[PDB]
Amino acid sequence: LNSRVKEILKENTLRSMQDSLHFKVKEVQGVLENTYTSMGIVKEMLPKDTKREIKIHLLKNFILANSHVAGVSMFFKNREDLRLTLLRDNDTIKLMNPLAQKAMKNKEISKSLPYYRKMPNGAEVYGVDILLPLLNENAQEVVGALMVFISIDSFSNEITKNRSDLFLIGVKGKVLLSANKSLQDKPIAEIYKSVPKATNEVLTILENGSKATLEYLDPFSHKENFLAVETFKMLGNLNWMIALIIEKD
């Protein structure tokens, strides 16, 4: 049978891979729908006819209350006095946007591309911004806006601490985080040039927002791998995805 069973063994493995991965994905999700809420609080309170001294603490608290959050920032249309921008030194520091606007012009909220933000010590952090229009007591008029800078790098906790077999992949297939940092901000279609059968199945699932398994010769290991991949809407509409690889052995 050694092939009848090599094939049942395969099934056994991919099943538990997807089980594990599905847990890995649940993890990373609730770490952000917690924030989007622990956030959200913030949206309603801030635009209160309260004071700059008040709101700072409000924001300075919400950063502290969300590890993977690395900064925030505030605007108010003609009340220009109310600009400010708080970031990560190891406490917060105060330092010194057609999307922010755009989502005011909506009252729907939006995200950005991943990008690298230089930080008060000098260090550059990969992250996305999450915009959040600020609106009036009646909520038919647009006040200012908020901006929460989510460190993608902060998720090495979930992604790369003591394992190195997971990948976080965001839009059109750009590796967002991975044990090897050479890959951050490069798209899978070029990292894995060698296996378009594979990257086209991954880019497809990403688009459709689903899960699958498959195999590919890895170009770093030079050996065949099993791959399980699974998606989730990063705000709680477009997908991020996590990948879990296992060398056949």
- Chain residues binding Cl ion by CB under 5 A are 170-171
Q: Measured from the CB of residue 14, what is the shortest distance to Cl ion in angstroms?
A: 27
- Asked if 70 and 85 touch (Cβ cutoff 8 Å), the reply is no
Q: Closest approach of Cβ 170 to Cl ion, in Å?
A: 3
Coil/strand/helix, residue 166: strand
Nearest-approach distance from CB 237 to Cl ion, in angstroms: 12
C-beta of residue 175 within 8 angstroms of C-beta of residue 191: yes
Distances (CA, A) of 28 to 20, 88, 128, 155, 233: 13, 21, 15, 8, 11
The closest residue (CB) to Cl ion is 170
The beta strands (E) that lie in 152-201 are given as 166-169, 175-178
Per the CB < 8 A criterion, the answer to whether 175 and 196 are in contact is no
Give whichever of 47 and 170 is closer to Cl ion, judged by the CB atom: 170
Shorter beta-carbon distance to Cl ion: residue 171 or 206: 171
**Minimal distance in Å, beta carbon 171 to Cl ion?**
4
User: Nearer to Cl ion by C-beta: 93 or 238?
Assistant: 238
| Nearest CB to Cl ion, comparing residues 171 and 188 | 171
